[PDB]
RNA sequence: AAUUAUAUAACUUAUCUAUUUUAAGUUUGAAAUUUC
RNA sequence: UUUUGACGGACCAAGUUACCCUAGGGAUCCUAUUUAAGUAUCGACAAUUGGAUCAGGACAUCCCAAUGGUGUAGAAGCUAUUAAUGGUUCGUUUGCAACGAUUAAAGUCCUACGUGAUCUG
């Protein structure tokens, strides 16, 4: 191929160079893209791989901050925010749109990607606006610890008490934890734990003034759908912002935060409030591909996945041997593979952690804290760790087992490129055999078209 | 640089060689290693030891060609001799003086043990009970190797004898005594030679293998014999208390059924159960004396 | 600053103190240990075995106060107790993660050492001589082997492992303090260290014997008859000489046995392996005498 | 290659023959199925 | 198929083809930007197999060096501050460890194996 004076950085780089896309080419809906995954059928061609390179070294979230209004324009506390969270110098796009309406008492629905500032989007108006005064519902216990820890840090600056309630915990133990802690202004609880307390009448939501739901799509899972309904009947909800500001008839302000929303959520919201009274805000990057994050795709058989994983681990070891490198996150679909793979890692004399949903709750909590403490730089975890896991220092996210759905990948994808990330994140996914090639085809096709992935509608 | 000389071929490590990648799966994964029936050897001397013993080798990786010439190349017919980076060998091994050797997983029943101990070989079987220490297992095999035991038995839960570290602890002792691994307790009676009496040196963790309802009535009242008395009048089997488990329940029960006793070694406190290498050593050696006399 | 809790006094150390720097070099660098003649002991109950057995304490550093309760509180009264950060301890030991506690010791004097009576119940009229021992686990295993066997007394010749080297002691895990050991025994004084004319048996089948043809082994040095290890050799007070790890017995040892009327003891090994691990080389011969002497 | 492999062939037992006190197993494979 | 008993999950198995078939692709220390100390012509710093030879740097101070205190009379020591100043050997290693022999001391590490530029096809 002739050497053009100005080549184009590879948008898609594959082991076979003939199909690489260097320059400005967009194919569109009608054109069938010649993807590297187009014909990834006959496993005889070992070691085929393609990687999406990082396009930006500067954080896109920090980019365009000058085009977004200041916190004062949002109605905002700043001195406490500067002391508590100096890192957020300027508001993000989601924060700028979401904060002003919340301070006015308007019910808000926020659809944005992980790490877009959704947590701070409601917390800032929540603090200014403020028998607990605020309730936080979180589906996974892992998220509860982070939310409680994050909320406690903010509370410590403001002298507020925050406690955590993890679902699946025994009724006697749950009561024991409640009695051993002082009264908390804001409570973070999971549907399983919160439902148990409500059934035993350990808490009342009639005096609740604010309810927070994190990961609404996950909270709407059938595992917690019934529990949420039981919570709703005990919770009076404000109908208009005027009632929220009415001292004679105070009611609870509802705020919804999630990355995706199942169809029919409007009907659930309609029976609690008028559809026109719900403020829906969508992030510009919601369901959009991340250019600054490297995504690696490699053809490996189940036998070769262990082979490449050792090679990848050795590559990371070599990188650490030359310059400091970030932690590596390994995602597996099943605990059995984690245990089966974990024994192989133990045979390699490699320090690593094993995390899966069926492990003891007490055991899981300690391991999660240990990883945050930096006890071990290698963590093997299941989808339970794809939600509510801190990955600010994670350099490589390894999906040993291919994620079943795009939504799960997004939660795994959100782990990299977070605010304050010390290292540039990377994503690695493995495909065993012709089981699944459409999912890779869809992801590759979207990148060439620079379009949102199919099926991500919230 | 790949060279062929006098029909002897040794290669040089290639960039991205999938041979090295496949080896890594085989080496550390014993189930895969058993699936491929291979073992890994460390050191020229220990490497040459297997060649002398007639074990079938698989592949050799070495930093210097001198090691191949230093080793007997005549026995290197079945090995692809590869010149590799010195840093790679230490990366491949979890411990390598410039060379590492892959060998076929030997079957000790099929292994050739020449005359010198066979003249001193006894109808004596050594049994390791829940021996979970890789160092002791290899360190143990010296005693079995030097003693001349007809066979060595390792109960289920014991360390893999063919693990390369156990070879380092024994420094080739696996090529000097038959070793049986992952023996089921129900099949242990079949593993004993005819008329063999099973003797258990007793030092307890083995009491945890007892049903709680039947825990207290299930203890065998098996006779205690001083280890200094004659016990080798007929073929005998020796049991070694594990470091973590000690002497197990089934060993005590089997000894009573086999007509044996407790060839009891008074265990000096400070070592709750005599070190399995120490416990193994004493039982074998004077058995040679007892039958020799 | 000393903190008092449940009758236990411990100082809070600060990183970078000159005391911390000295320990790091001693443990990590063996030559510094020889230059300074200092040793390291790890483990709360391992320290307890050392102090109860007469070990000379210098200072004890622990990450958590719980170790002090398990420490030999009787022997801590005059020893500096300082609670130190675990990171400081990690920088010191050859092991990244010690047992939460480590102690500084000077070279213990065997005369003042107190060994438990438990070996004595099984102790034999058998003395052990170590020749050019080079491995720490073997020495610790040898003393742990002796702590399991019951050797009456041990003689260490010149060139052997420093018995008090930190990794040597860890393998012993308290066995160093359970059996008598004599260090820096001169080869000329070895027969005097044993009862005069004590039959000395040399373990011979070695690494030097691998390089040297078997035939050329009796020309200039005294000729020792090769005997089977199982043949009764403890009819008289017996002494056993064991070669160093992967090196073998020295020339002086072979001279010793003939002068005392001893002979070579043969360990029949399967052809295809020239020798085996040295640690149990003592054990195999040590127990052989044990039953023979008991009978 | 993996997985089976009552084509056959062998042995064991029947079988069929002698005396006299092909089928069922297993093994090879004519092959079959799937992947490479 | 409803009931009675003391949180997170829907599939496994190699080659080879020149006997082939189809689809095609070829041939038939720089370099490119950006910056500009010193923009005719240029242009630092930057930004986009074992070995041998020679080391540079970090301080988390081993030796050397400067000091306080002392259960320091002096001198030695012990404890404590300050300091990277230059040094910090040669080998064996039955391969993760350790030993030998020396040294004022043979600190702990980093520096694409820290660092070598045949000849041919």
Curated annotation (Swiss-Prot), chain A:
Q: Which residues form the Helicase C-terminal domain?
A: 305-458
Give the matching SUPFAM superfamilies: P-loop containing nucleoside triphosphate hydrolases
* Keyword annotations from UniProtKB, A to Z: ATP-binding, Helicase, Hydrolase, Mitochondrion, Mitochondrion nucleoid, Nucleotide-binding, Nucleus, Ribosome biogenesis, RNA-binding, rRNA-binding
Could you tell me the Gene Ontology terms of the biological process aspect for this record? mitochondrial large ribosomal subunit assembly
Which intervals of this chain are the motif Nuclear localization signal? 448-451
E.C. numbers: 3.6.4.13
The disulfides recorded in the entry are none
Question: Where, per UniProt, does this protein localize?
Answer: Nucleus; Mitochondrion; Mitochondrion matrix, Mitochondrion nucleoid; Mitochondrion matrix
Q: List where the motif DEAD lies.
A: 214-217
Catalysis performed (reactions): ATP + H2O = ADP + phosphate + H(+)
Q: Name one GO cellular component term.
A: nucleolus
The motif Q motif: which residues? 69-96
Under the heading InterPro entries, the entry gives: DEAD/DEAH_box_helicase_dom, Helicase_ATP-bd, Helicase_C-like, P-loop_NTPase, RNA_helicase_DEAD_Q_motif
GO MF annotations for this entry? ATP binding; ATP hydrolysis activity; RNA helicase activity; rRNA binding
Domain of life per record: Eukaryota
The Helicase ATP-binding domain covers 99-279
Q: Where is this motif: Nuclear export signal?
A: 120-130
Query: Which parts of the sequence bind ATP?
Result: 112-119
CDD domains in the cross-refs: SF2_C_DEAD (cd18787)
According to its UniProt record, which protein family does this protein belong to? Belongs to the DEAD box helicase family.
Summarize the protein's role: Plays an essential role in facilitating the proper assembly of the mitochondrial large ribosomal subunit and its helicase activity is essential for this function. May be involved in RNA processing or transport. Has RNA and Mg(2+)-dependent ATPase activity.
Q: How does it assemble?
A: Monomer. Found in a complex with GRSF1, DHX30, FASTKD2 and FASTKD5. Associates with the 16S mitochondrial rRNA (16S mt-rRNA) and with the mitochondrial ribosome large subunit (39S).
Its protein name is Probable ATP-dependent RNA helicase DDX28
Organism encoding this protein: Mus musculus (Mouse)
Organism lineage: Eukaryota, Metazoa, Chordata, Craniata, Vertebrata
Give the gene symbol: Ddx28
From Swiss-Prot, chain B:
Instruction: State which Enzyme Commission number(s) the record gives.
Output: 2.1.1.-
Picking any one GO molecular function of the record gives: rRNA (guanosine-2'-O-)-methyltransferase activity
| Enzymatic reactions | guanosine(1370) in 16S rRNA + S-adenosyl-L-methionine = 2'-O-methylguanosine(1370) in 16S rRNA + S-adenosyl-L-homocysteine + H(+)
The residues the entry assigns to the signal sequence are: none
Q: Which domain of life is it from?
A: Eukaryota
Predominant subcellular localization, coarse grouping: mitochondrion
UniProt: S-adenosyl-L-methionine binding residues: 241, 265, 274
User: Does the keyword S-adenosyl-L-methionine feature in the UniProt annotation?
Assistant: yes
A cellular component term (GO) from this record? Answer: mitochondrial matrix
**Localization terms from the record:** Mitochondrion
Q: What role is this protein assigned?
A: S-adenosyl-L-methionine-dependent 2'-O-ribose methyltransferase that catalyzes the formation of 2'-O-methylguanosine at position 1370 (Gm1370) in the 16S mitochondrial large subunit ribosomal RNA (mtLSU rRNA), a conserved modification in the peptidyl transferase domain of the mtLSU rRNA. Also required for formation of 2'-O-methyluridine at position 1369 (Um1369) mediated by MRM2.
- Which family is this protein grouped under? Belongs to the class IV-like SAM-binding methyltransferase superfamily. RNA methyltransferase TrmH family.
Name this protein carries in UniProt: rRNA methyltransferase 3, mitochondrial
Included range, full protein: 85 to 406 of 418
